[PDB]
From Swiss-Prot, chain A:
Keyword line: Ribonucleoprotein, Ribosomal protein, RNA-binding, rRNA-binding
Gene field: rplN
Sections of the chain in a coiled coil: none
PANTHER family named among the record's database cross-references: 50S/60S RIBOSOMAL PROTEIN L14/L23 (PTHR11761), LARGE RIBOSOMAL SUBUNIT PROTEIN UL14M (PTHR11761:SF3)
Designated name of the protein: Large ribosomal subunit protein uL14
Subunit structure comment from the entry: Part of the 50S ribosomal subunit. Forms a cluster with proteins L3 and L19. In the 70S ribosome, L14 and L19 interact and together make contacts with the 16S rRNA in bridges B5 and B8.
HAMAP family: Ribosomal_uL14
Example of a GO cellular component annotation carried by this entry: cytosolic large ribosomal subunit
Gene Ontology molecular function: any one: large ribosomal subunit rRNA binding
A Pfam family that the UniProt record links to this protein: Ribosomal_L14
Record function comment: Binds to 23S rRNA. Forms part of two intersubunit bridges in the 70S ribosome.
Species in which this protein is naturally found: Bacillus subtilis (strain 168)
Entry similarity comment: Belongs to the universal ribosomal protein uL14 family.
Curated annotation (Swiss-Prot), chain B:
Any one GO BP annotation for this protein: translation
This protein's record includes keyword Nucleotide-binding: no
Biological role stated in the UniProt entry: One of the primary rRNA binding proteins, it binds directly near the 3'-end of the 23S rRNA, where it nucleates assembly of the 50S subunit. Strongly stimulates 23S rRNA precursor processing by mini-ribonuclease 3 (MrnC); 20-30% DMSO can replace L3, suggesting the protein may alter rRNA conformation.
Keyword Cytoplasm carried by entry: no
Residue numbers spanned by region Disordered: 121-151
Assembly, per entry: Part of the 50S ribosomal subunit. Forms a cluster with proteins L14 and L19. Interacts with RNA helicase CshA.
Gene Ontology MF term list: rRNA binding; structural constituent of ribosome
GO terms under cellular component: cytosolic large ribosomal subunit
Family: Belongs to the universal ribosomal protein uL3 family.
Naturally occurring in which organism (per UniProt): Bacillus subtilis (strain 168)
Coiled coil residues, start to end: none
PROSITE patterns: RIBOSOMAL_L3
Pfam families to which the protein is assigned, alphabetical: Ribosomal_L3 (PF00297)
Protein name stated in the entry: Large ribosomal subunit protein uL3
Gene field: rplC
Swiss-Prot record, chain C:
PROSITE patterns xrefs: RIBOSOMAL_L36 (PS00828)
Originating species: Bacillus subtilis (strain 168)
HAMAP family (alphabetical): Ribosomal_bL36 (MF_00251)
Pfam short name (any one): Ribosomal_L36
Name the record gives this protein: Large ribosomal subunit protein bL36
Top-level division of the source organism's lineage: Bacteria
GO biological-process terms attached to the record: translation
PANTHER family per UniProt: 50S RIBOSOMAL PROTEIN L36, CHLOROPLASTIC, LARGE RIBOSOMAL SUBUNIT PROTEIN BL36C
Assembly notes: Part of the 50S ribosomal subunit.
InterPro entries (alphabetical): Ribosomal_bL36 (IPR000473), Ribosomal_bL36_sp (IPR035977)
Transferase listed as a keyword: no
From Swiss-Prot, chain D:
InterPro entries: Ribosomal_uL6-like, Ribosomal_uL6-like_a/b-dom_sf, Ribosomal_uL6_a/b-dom, Ribosomal_uL6_bac-type, Ribosomal_uL6_CS
Annotated organism of origin: Bacillus subtilis (strain 168)
GO MF annotations, alphabetized: rRNA binding; structural constituent of ribosome
One cellular-component annotation, GO: cytosolic large ribosomal subunit
GO biological process, alphabetically ordered: cytoplasmic translation
Keywords of this entry: Ribonucleoprotein, Ribosomal protein, RNA-binding, rRNA-binding
Function comment: This protein binds to the 23S rRNA, and is important in its secondary structure. It is located near the subunit interface in the base of the L7/L12 stalk, and near the tRNA binding site of the peptidyltransferase center.
Descriptive protein name: Large ribosomal subunit protein uL6
Family statement: Belongs to the universal ribosomal protein uL6 family.
Gene3D superfamilies: Ribosomal protein L6, alpha-beta domain
Highest taxon of the lineage: Bacteria
RNA sequence: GAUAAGUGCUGAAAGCAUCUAAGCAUGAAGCCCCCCUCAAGAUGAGAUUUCCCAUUCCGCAAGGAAGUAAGAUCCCUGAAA
RNA sequence: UGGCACCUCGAUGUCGGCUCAUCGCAUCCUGGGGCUGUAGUCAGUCCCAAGGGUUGGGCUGUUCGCCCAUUAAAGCGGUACGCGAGCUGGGUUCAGAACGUCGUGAGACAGUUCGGUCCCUAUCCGUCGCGGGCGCAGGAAAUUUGAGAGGAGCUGUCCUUAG
RNA sequence: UAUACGUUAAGUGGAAAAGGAUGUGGAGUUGCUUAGACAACU
């Protein structure tokens, strides 16, 4: 459950280390984002010499959450952290490598580049 | 229009053929009996009166026994009517069984919601609290009763009072399974009322 | 449609009519449709 | 009224009857038409010569006079010759077909459009880009013809859509 | 289903024309329904099914009183309330 | 914004915010239309329409406004500039103190600044719930019709039609 | 639910202007008109 002021780890090499959630997209009063949802965020921590720089307003997709996601078959998946990937509008990641496992839910939302790049898609 | 009376037994879950896990409510409906057919000529409208759940003789009184004498059945604990039914397809004394429904059929389920007793505006009407800190002395109160001009409160200003225990219909539930041997209906999702409470399952009115 | 208090012929071909106790101007030119109001 | 004063010579094979309620029936080759008229209208039939008479010269009566004559004139010509309104389909791909007793129109929508003619009307479709409404009552032909044209009224840039036969569609310049 | 703005058909007054005067349509998240809930104190107190049955006193009657029928309550064990 | 001084000085508590709304339509979105200097996508303007909906933050006591990010939309007003015997008390106008300035001065603002007690057990009507009594031409047990009342009423994106 | 004679169709009566209008009633003037008008038809 990602909301405004939630800080996320970045699971790629775009240059951002930590982002702060500015806004959850996709409906007027929408309070919370979950895995697979796109958020607007600011880069709070950046890697020196990265493509993305501290203080930039970027779009990201949430790839891991502590709350996790329930599946139709009645199973659940949770992670120990909330992580996102900086993206463009076409849903390609702005980085080139994805770190850590990502949820199967990204395939449903057509984040296929991210899924292919992930070291594990659970 | 089809319908049947039953008791709410509880909830569980069932795996679908495609692997999905569907939560279901178990409704137990010992065969209902048609006690009376009302007609437009005699009564002014068409309806079938279903009796359910045979009551002990001791608990039944003489007026009840006479009413169910024509149907030739034990007195029933629960009597309800169904309107919109095919009158000619029913006869007094006919037993209505769960097998009128089939898996996948869409039904409406009526019941009385669980009572909650005296509840405040927050719980009863889902209103917002005031601040809990910053000097606030306004936490679970129901809000201004209205403007000054009318010199009175408008009707429908929501306030604390008894909550729950109202008749409530849930529409467009799916029948998951019909266990004719045990007279059970498995309906997807949940329905109003406490366990053992009377439930009415009708063919969906929006179908 | 022009909805104005002053409905008048704008050209010679405009015709003033009264439909439903309302003064109107119908004309071949669609810009000249007027209704009083 | 000039219009109301006119007298309608009934053709040979047309029969006009009335029930003294100003309910003139008119049988003829194409069919039968019934129409209740305003009580205070003297309708006379003297050997295939119809005339209407106004009792008093006054706004309401003057109007009803001319109308009653006009409507009678249509009833007689209707059952004898009958009326018809022609429609034209303009536009690439616009075409009309008759699936039994239902006009089917492919007028650039994502579905076909079906008009079912009401009792008394026939819709001939000589070509695919020409429709013909036929009937005894002049009102019903106009009504049905209007319904069909309403499906795709002529637009002003290219003229596409169902228009009436010989309708002066007011064209505009696009770019 | 009936309408609003709008679109009309037939049609005179006013040989033409005109959605209108008579007449006939179409047409909105809106109106009346459809859907959910309460509802006969609706004093206009409704309707249907079933049950009980014409007792004993007095008073000239009107009427009053006393036991009861069907049924219900007090009281008691409780909660799904 | 004013003009008047008719009610209130043996008291009709203030700006902003919070809780709760309600109404008008001069309609912000959604719905239906006329005209266009409307090709399409968009728009402009006018008509009908009040059913529902009409965001979260940074700065500031703020209303407002600017800005950040969204949304179909971020409507305009009335209700004692709705709502303090419902809350808050940051601003402003009690007593302290200080700066600038004015004054011979006590002090003052043509300006600022830090700190500063928000009382009341609901009688009546009203509002939300729950009972007792009687009535409804016999006494009861169930099931009901619906005069009438309330509720709900929102909308995005994508695929297809079809490049 | 008077009498007599007219007016209004707007529930005007029972709320407001400039302005607009083939609403309707009553007076008057004047152009043309069976050597044939207005309208519609070559
Ligand atoms: K000094
Ligand atoms: Mg406290
Ligand atoms: Mg009052
Ligand atoms: Mg004075
Ligand atoms: Mg006083
Ligand atoms: Mg006081
Ligand atoms: Mg308006
Ligand atoms: Mg105020
Ligand atoms: Mg108050
Ligand atoms: Mg303060
Ligand atoms: Mg009082
Ligand atoms: Zn014109």
């Amino acid at each position: 459950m990602i909301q405004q002021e939630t800080r996320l780890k970045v699971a790629d090499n775009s240059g951002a280390r930590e982002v702060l959630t500015i806004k959850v997209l996709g409906g007027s009063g929408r309070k919370t984002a979950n895995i697979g949802d796109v958020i607007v965020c600011t880069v709070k921590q950046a890697t020196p010499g990265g493509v993305v720089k501290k203080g930039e307003v970027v779009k990201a997709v949430i790839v891991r959450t502590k709350s996790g996601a329930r599946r139709s078959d009645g199973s659940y998946i949770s992670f120990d952290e909330n992580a996102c990937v900086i993206i463009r509008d076409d849903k390609s990641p702005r980085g080139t490598r994805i770190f850590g496992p990502v949820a199967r839910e990204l395939r449903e939302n057509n984040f296929m580049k991210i899924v292919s790049l992930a070291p594990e898609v659970i | 229009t089809k319908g049947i009376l039953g008791r709410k037994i509880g909830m569980t879950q069932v795996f679908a053929e495609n692997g999905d896990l569907i939560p279901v409510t178990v409704i137990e409906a010992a065969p209902n009996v048609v006690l009376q057919k009302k007609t437009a000529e005699n009564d002014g409208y068409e309806a079938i009166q279903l009796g359910f759940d045979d009551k002990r003789e001791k608990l039944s009184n003489k007026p009840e026994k006479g009413h169910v004498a024509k149907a030739e059945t034990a007195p029933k604990r629960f009597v309800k009517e169904l309107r919109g039914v095919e009158m000619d397809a029913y006869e007094v004394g006919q037993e209505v069984k769960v097998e009128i429904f089939s898996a996948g059929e869409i039904v409406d389920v009526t019941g009385v919601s669980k009572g909650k007793g005296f509840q405040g505006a927050i719980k009863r009407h889902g209103q917002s609290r005031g601040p809990m800190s910053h000097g606030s002395r306004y936490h679970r109160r129901p809000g201004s009763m209205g403007p000054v001009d009318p010199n009175r409160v408008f009707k429908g200003k929501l306030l604390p009072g008894r909550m729950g225990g109202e008749q409530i219909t849930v529409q467009n539930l799916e029948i998951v399974k019909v266990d004719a041997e045990r007279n059970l209906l498995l309906i997807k999702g949940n329905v109003p009322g406490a366990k053992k409470s009377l439930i009415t399952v009708k063919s969906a009115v929006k179908s | 449609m022009k909805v104005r208090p002053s409905v008048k012929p704008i050209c010679e071909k405009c015709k003033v009519i009264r439909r439903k106790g309302k003064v109107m101007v119908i004309c071949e030119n669609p810009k000249h449709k007027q209704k009083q109001g | 009224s000039r219009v109301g004063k006119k007298l309608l010579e009934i053709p040979s094979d047309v029969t006009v009857t009335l029930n003294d309620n100003n309910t003139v029936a008119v049988k003829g080759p194409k069919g039968e038409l019934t129409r209740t008229f305003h009580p205070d209208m003297e309708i006379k039939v003297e050997d295939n010569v119809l005339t209407v008479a106004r009792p008093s010269d006054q706004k309401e009566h003057r109007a009803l006079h001319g109308t009653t004559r006009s409507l009678l004139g249509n009833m007689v010509e209707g059952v004898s010759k009958g009326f018809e309104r022609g429609l034209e389909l303009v536009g690439v791909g616009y075409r009309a077909s008759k699936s039994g007793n239902k006009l089917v129109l492919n007028v650039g929508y994502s579905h076909p459009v079906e008009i079912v003619p009401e009792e008394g009307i026939e819709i001939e479709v000589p070509s695919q880009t020409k429709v013909v409404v036929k009937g005894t009552d002049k009102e019903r032909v106009g009504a049905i013809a209007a319904n069909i044209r309403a499906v795709r009224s002529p637009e002003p840039y290219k003229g596409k859509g169902i228009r009436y036969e010989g309708e002066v569609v007011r064209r505009k310049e696009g770019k």
